[PDB]
Design a protein around this ligand. Sequence first.
Ligand code: HET
Length: 254
Amino acid sequence: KDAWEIPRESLRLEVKLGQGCFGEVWMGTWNGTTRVAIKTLKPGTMSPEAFLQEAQVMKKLRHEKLVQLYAVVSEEPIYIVTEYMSKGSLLDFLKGETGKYLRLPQLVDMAAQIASGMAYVERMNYVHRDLRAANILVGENLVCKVADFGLARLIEFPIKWTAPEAALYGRFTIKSDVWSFGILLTELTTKGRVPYPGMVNREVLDQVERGYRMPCPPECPESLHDLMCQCWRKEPEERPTFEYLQAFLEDYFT
Ligand SMILES: CP(C)(=O)c1ccc(Nc2nc(C3CCCC3)nc3c2ncn3CCc2cccc(O)c2)cc1
């Protein structure tokens, strides 16, 4: 146990925002005053030690562009308490009505933020491994935080987002995340459309290995598509660093 623990009695779960195979996500209050989001462990899906691995990472990962860990209740049902993001996953937001009026600059701005969070994880020597629009949370003011560190591992699957070397040989490095990001970029620029349309798992992989890359989205500026191509380079070392991506994305409209 440790200093991140809080009494279960201090939390009032209220609305169920969504749910994953490994638990669920509820909106609630902490000590009556703080409105939070709690991720619970359904007694079946997996071992409590594992559900907690995610929180541990968050105990060490603290950045304004990463969802913030508030507290934990490691007594099963395990609760993981974090800040609350008013708009939910970026994916839904995009596929939603408010997302349809979003313009290039707003989109790039959001990309810039995600990149900022990732620039942190990068210099912190961790690898997220599950980077896609579904794992980004939109708070108030089109602010985006990065969630889901269930696969976050310090450098000692959703195939359509996973870099080939990682999907194939297990080489997960921050570079395979850069790959995932370029894919995320297509989601932003396509208003949440699915990567590699009409393609199945094995097919996607075979295509990418044969050098196939997604074409520049319509409505999407080549320069941005070029950026996506740097992310998708076959050579992990030829892929950009998040620090760069970030600087670049911020400077975009200039
Ligand atoms: C539908 P709507 C607009 O009323 C809505 C409004 C606000 C939100 N808000 C949120 N939705 C979802 C997820 C739960 C299901 C989808 C996103 N997750 C959220 C939300 N706020 C903070 N987290 C982080 C939860 C968390 C805890 C521990 C570890 C983690 O990795 C992540 C969600 C939906």
